[PDB]
PDB file of C-alpha atoms and ligand atoms in Angstrom:
ATOM      1  CA  UNK A   1      -6.230 -16.141  -9.882  1.00  0.00           C
ATOM      2  CA  UNK A   2      -7.992 -13.379  -7.838  1.00  0.00           C
ATOM      3  CA  UNK A   3      -5.616 -11.412  -5.683  1.00  0.00           C
ATOM      4  CA  UNK A   4      -6.834  -9.637  -2.613  1.00  0.00           C
ATOM      5  CA  UNK A   5      -5.481  -6.166  -3.071  1.00  0.00           C
ATOM      6  CA  UNK A   6      -5.098  -3.698  -0.153  1.00  0.00           C
ATOM      7  CA  UNK A   7      -7.443  -0.831   0.526  1.00  0.00           C
ATOM      8  CA  UNK A   8      -6.469   2.832   0.207  1.00  0.00           C
ATOM      9  CA  UNK A   9      -3.128   2.124   1.790  1.00  0.00           C
ATOM     10  CA  UNK A  10       0.250   3.144   0.532  1.00  0.00           C
ATOM     11  CA  UNK A  11       2.973   0.733  -0.227  1.00  0.00           C
ATOM     12  CA  UNK A  12       6.454   1.380   0.938  1.00  0.00           C
ATOM     13  CA  UNK A  13       7.603   3.014  -2.292  1.00  0.00           C
ATOM     14  CA  UNK A  14       6.168   0.119  -4.267  1.00  0.00           C
ATOM     15  CA  UNK A  15       7.076  -2.676  -1.814  1.00  0.00           C
ATOM     16  CA  UNK A  16       4.635  -5.036  -0.025  1.00  0.00           C
ATOM     17  CA  UNK A  17       1.310  -3.451   1.016  1.00  0.00           C
ATOM     18  CA  UNK A  18       1.940  -4.333   4.639  1.00  0.00           C
ATOM     19  CA  UNK A  19       4.813  -1.935   4.609  1.00  0.00           C
ATOM     20  CA  UNK A  20       4.217   1.759   4.233  1.00  0.00           C
ATOM     21  CA  UNK A  21       6.467   4.594   3.411  1.00  0.00           C
ATOM     22  CA  UNK A  22       5.998   8.329   2.842  1.00  0.00           C
ATOM     23  CA  UNK A  23       6.827  10.006  -0.477  1.00  0.00           C
ATOM     24  CA  UNK A  24       9.862  11.648   1.146  1.00  0.00           C
ATOM     25  CA  UNK A  25      11.331   8.159   1.590  1.00  0.00           C
ATOM     26  CA  UNK A  26      10.219   6.970  -1.799  1.00  0.00           C
ATOM     27  CA  UNK A  27      10.887   9.746  -4.240  1.00  0.00           C
ATOM     28  CA  UNK A  28      12.587  11.967  -1.619  1.00  0.00           C
ATOM     29  CA  UNK A  29       9.917  14.539  -2.335  1.00  0.00           C
ATOM     30  CA  UNK A  30       9.031  16.316   0.868  1.00  0.00           C
TER      31      UNK A  30
HETATM   32  C1  LIG B 101      -9.687  -2.497   2.241  1.00  0.00           C
HETATM   33  O1  LIG B 101     -10.024  -2.668   0.850  1.00  0.00           O
HETATM   34  C2  LIG B 101      -9.170  -3.645   0.182  1.00  0.00           C
HETATM   35  C3  LIG B 101      -9.564  -3.671  -1.292  1.00  0.00           C
HETATM   36  O2  LIG B 101     -10.123  -2.391  -1.626  1.00  0.00           O
HETATM   37  C4  LIG B 101     -10.407  -2.063  -2.989  1.00  0.00           C
HETATM   38  O3  LIG B 101     -11.859  -2.004  -3.087  1.00  0.00           O
HETATM   39  C5  LIG B 101     -12.429  -1.117  -2.095  1.00  0.00           C
HETATM   40  C6  LIG B 101     -13.936  -1.219  -2.247  1.00  0.00           C
HETATM   41  O4  LIG B 101     -14.272  -2.097  -3.320  1.00  0.00           O
HETATM   42  C7  LIG B 101     -11.877   0.317  -2.281  1.00  0.00           C
HETATM   43  O5  LIG B 101     -12.381   1.169  -1.224  1.00  0.00           O
HETATM   44  C8  LIG B 101     -12.382   0.611   0.114  1.00  0.00           C
HETATM   45  O6  LIG B 101     -13.737   0.469   0.586  1.00  0.00           O
HETATM   46  C9  LIG B 101     -14.420   1.750   0.708  1.00  0.00           C
HETATM   47  C10 LIG B 101     -15.828   1.434   1.174  1.00  0.00           C
HETATM   48  O7  LIG B 101     -15.919   0.081   1.582  1.00  0.00           O
HETATM   49  C11 LIG B 101     -13.664   2.647   1.702  1.00  0.00           C
HETATM   50  O8  LIG B 101     -13.639   2.063   3.002  1.00  0.00           O
HETATM   51  C12 LIG B 101     -12.247   2.848   1.210  1.00  0.00           C
HETATM   52  O9  LIG B 101     -11.527   3.572   2.206  1.00  0.00           O
HETATM   53  C13 LIG B 101     -11.589   1.479   1.081  1.00  0.00           C
HETATM   54  O10 LIG B 101     -10.259   1.647   0.602  1.00  0.00           O
HETATM   55  C14 LIG B 101     -10.359   0.269  -2.166  1.00  0.00           C
HETATM   56  O11 LIG B 101      -9.786   1.589  -2.282  1.00  0.00           O
HETATM   57  C15 LIG B 101      -9.818  -0.669  -3.233  1.00  0.00           C
HETATM   58  N1  LIG B 101      -8.370  -0.728  -3.188  1.00  0.00           N
HETATM   59  C16 LIG B 101      -7.648  -0.464  -4.259  1.00  0.00           C
HETATM   60  C17 LIG B 101      -6.161  -0.601  -4.121  1.00  0.00           C
HETATM   61  O12 LIG B 101      -8.158  -0.130  -5.337  1.00  0.00           O
HETATM   62  C18 LIG B 101      -9.318  -4.985   0.863  1.00  0.00           C
HETATM   63  O13 LIG B 101     -10.676  -5.407   0.771  1.00  0.00           O
HETATM   64  C19 LIG B 101      -8.924  -4.832   2.323  1.00  0.00           C
HETATM   65  O14 LIG B 101      -9.086  -6.078   2.969  1.00  0.00           O
HETATM   66  C20 LIG B 101      -7.946  -6.613   3.626  1.00  0.00           C
HETATM   67  O15 LIG B 101      -7.028  -7.073   2.610  1.00  0.00           O
HETATM   68  C21 LIG B 101      -5.848  -7.662   3.203  1.00  0.00           C
HETATM   69  C22 LIG B 101      -4.887  -7.990   2.087  1.00  0.00           C
HETATM   70  O16 LIG B 101      -5.084  -7.118   0.986  1.00  0.00           O
HETATM   71  C23 LIG B 101      -6.237  -8.867   4.065  1.00  0.00           C
HETATM   72  O17 LIG B 101      -6.909  -9.860   3.284  1.00  0.00           O
HETATM   73  C24 LIG B 101      -7.167  -8.405   5.170  1.00  0.00           C
HETATM   74  O18 LIG B 101      -7.571  -9.573   5.888  1.00  0.00           O
HETATM   75  C25 LIG B 101      -8.396  -7.763   4.518  1.00  0.00           C
HETATM   76  O19 LIG B 101      -9.264  -7.183   5.520  1.00  0.00           O
HETATM   77  C26 LIG B 101      -9.456  -7.851   6.775  1.00  0.00           C
HETATM   78  O20 LIG B 101     -10.883  -8.056   6.917  1.00  0.00           O
HETATM   79  C27 LIG B 101     -11.609  -6.807   6.809  1.00  0.00           C
HETATM   80  C28 LIG B 101     -13.080  -7.133   6.833  1.00  0.00           C
HETATM   81  O21 LIG B 101     -13.264  -8.496   7.174  1.00  0.00           O
HETATM   82  C29 LIG B 101     -11.163  -5.846   7.928  1.00  0.00           C
HETATM   83  O22 LIG B 101     -11.408  -6.423   9.213  1.00  0.00           O
HETATM   84  C30 LIG B 101      -9.685  -5.604   7.786  1.00  0.00           C
HETATM   85  O23 LIG B 101      -9.209  -4.762   8.824  1.00  0.00           O
HETATM   86  C31 LIG B 101      -8.966  -6.922   7.890  1.00  0.00           C
HETATM   87  O24 LIG B 101      -7.580  -6.657   7.784  1.00  0.00           O
HETATM   88  C32 LIG B 101      -9.831  -3.806   2.974  1.00  0.00           C
HETATM   89  N2  LIG B 101      -9.420  -3.576   4.332  1.00  0.00           N
HETATM   90  C33 LIG B 101     -10.218  -2.934   5.150  1.00  0.00           C
HETATM   91  C34 LIG B 101      -9.677  -2.589   6.493  1.00  0.00           C
HETATM   92  O25 LIG B 101     -11.351  -2.581   4.826  1.00  0.00           O
END
């Protein structure tokens, strides 16, 4: 089943593609 993946968008730390999060909130690296 073909999934429509997002574009060059970031996920919120690996969550849904509609949610975005910076690295500082994901791996605390900032
Ligand atoms: C963005 O791209 C998503 C899939 O992208 C992958 O493939 C493309 C090209 O094959 C890669 O590069 C993308 O395209 C190039 C040139 O066209 C550049 O613009 C890059 O910046 C761009 O990222 C891309 O990197 C690949 N991704 C990965 C992870 O490898 C989708 O096609 C996305 O489309 C949206 O998807 C969501 C759910 O995933 C919904 O289905 C949206 O409805 C859908 O787009 C909607 O329609 C669009 C055109 O009709 C547009 O109006 C959009 O705003 C709507 O939300 C796609 N999104 C956009 C904005 O292009």
